[PDB]
């Protein structure tokens, strides 16, 4: 089950 | 007894190409089970072991959208890193990410993982407390501040303790005899007459899964690294692996040399010698 990332770098 | 899940994510920018290529690979117990590739005709997450075909279309549609979102995230991040490192246009660049979780035999969370690399190099990583960040590069400190300010660690901590565990539990119930298997190494020794007075004994281990294995040699004794050559473990291409370790020896006196093969599938370490 894939993660979704939070803030961009 | 222990288990893991990992997503390994990559985006690659190249000089001329409008948009970067994004690839994501998921693994349960170190075996690939899903994949997304933005180069594909009509990109989606695809199953990569037969046991994943049980999931209906709502599973795939959601995972695919998550992938498209990640690709948008890697796109913006690649761009921001370019500026952070005062890199100009016309180069090639890489951004990679590693997943989430390890369970113990009791199926409880042992550890969460979240790491990022730029140009193949540690950029930022969530520490094992799942609360603080490690960023070595001066350029990475910009990301570390931005992510400390917005409580990013909490988002990733919730995934890692929550969905990552829950869905790994589910996946493990679904492929129950496909990933509760280990193949033992079958081992043999071969003999190679080499420049006179001396010879190479080569200890082979074939047909084993998983990859982790150790081959030792004893001079009747207790240890040998003095011209012990080996090869890195290699895939056979059928899901099993291969390795040899060799040692140089007096011809005639080769019957007192013993090879030992240590593998998790073995009841006890294998022992054999040259058998003429």
């Amino acid at each position: 089950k894939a993660l979704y990332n939070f803030a961009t770098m | 007894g222990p288990h893991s899940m990992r997503y390994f994510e990559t985006a690659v920018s190249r000089p001329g190409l409008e948009e970067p290529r994004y690839i994501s690979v998921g693994y349960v117990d170190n075996k690939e089970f899903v994949r997304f590739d933005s180069d594909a005709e009509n990109p989606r997450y695809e199953p990569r072991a037969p046991w994943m075909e049980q999931e209906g279309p709502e599973y795939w549609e959601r995972e695919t959208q998550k992938a498209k979102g990640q690709e948008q995230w890697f796109r913006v991040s690649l761009r921001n890193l370019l500026g952070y490192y005062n890199q100009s246009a016309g180069g090639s660049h890489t951004l990679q990410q590693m997943s989430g979780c390890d369970l113990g035999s009791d199926w409880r969370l042992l550890r969460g993982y979240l790491q990022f690399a730029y140009e193949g190099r540690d950029y930022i990583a969530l520490n094992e407390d799942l609360k603080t960040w490690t960023a070595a590069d001066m350029a990475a400190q910009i990301t570390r501040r931005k992510w400390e300010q917005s409580g990013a660690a909490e988002h990733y901590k919730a995934y890692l303790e929550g969905e990552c565990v829950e869905w790994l539990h589910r996946y493990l119930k679904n492929g129950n005899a496909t990933l509760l298997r280990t193949d033992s190494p079958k081992a043999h020794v071969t003999h190679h007459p080499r420049s006179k007075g001396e010879v190479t004994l080569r200890c082979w281990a074939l047909g084993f899964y998983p990859a982790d294995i150790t081959l030792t040699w004893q001079l009747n004794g207790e240890e040998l690294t003095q011209d012990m050559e080996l090869v890195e473990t290699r895939p056979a291409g059928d899901g099993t692996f291969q390795k040899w370790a060799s040692v140089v020896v007096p011809l005639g006196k080769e019957q007192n040399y013993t090879c030992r093969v240590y593998h998790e599938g073995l009841p006890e370490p294998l022992t054999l010698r040259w058998e003429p």
Binding site: - | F8, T10, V12, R14, I23, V25, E32, R35, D37, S92, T94, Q96, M98, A117, E119, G120, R121, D122, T190, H192, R202, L206, V231, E232, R234, P235, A236, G237, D238, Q242
Partner: protein
């Protein structure tokens, strides 16, 4: 910065002259992920060569398995030639049946 590829060439099964087999070229530990891998018989590119998908290790470095059907003989020699930006020149390794 570049990490130079490590290469092995070996058969899937114990080689025996006259017997169909699979020859692998296993290339690891490289960066960036763009690479060129040819398999060779008697110095010449073998046309149908299978290429597993781009994967990376936990040290971040990429790896690939390339393979092709082949029948070993006493006399033919097989090799793998790898071109990558870590290396000014290509790198060739020869299949040794042992």
């Amino acid at each position: 910065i570049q990490k130079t590829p490590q290469i092995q060439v070996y058969s899937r099964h114990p080689p025996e002259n006259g017997k169909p087999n699979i020859l692998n070229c296993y290339v690891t530990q490289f960066h960036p992920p763009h690479i060129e891998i040819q398999m060779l018989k008697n110095g010449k590119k073998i046309p149908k060569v299978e290429m597993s998908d781009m994967s990376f290790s936990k040290d971040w470095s990429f790896y690939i398995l390339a393979h092709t059907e082949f029948t070993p003989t006493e006399t033919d020699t097989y090799a793998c030639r790898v071109k990558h930006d870590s290396m000014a020149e290509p790198k060739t390794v020869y299949w040794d049946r042992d």
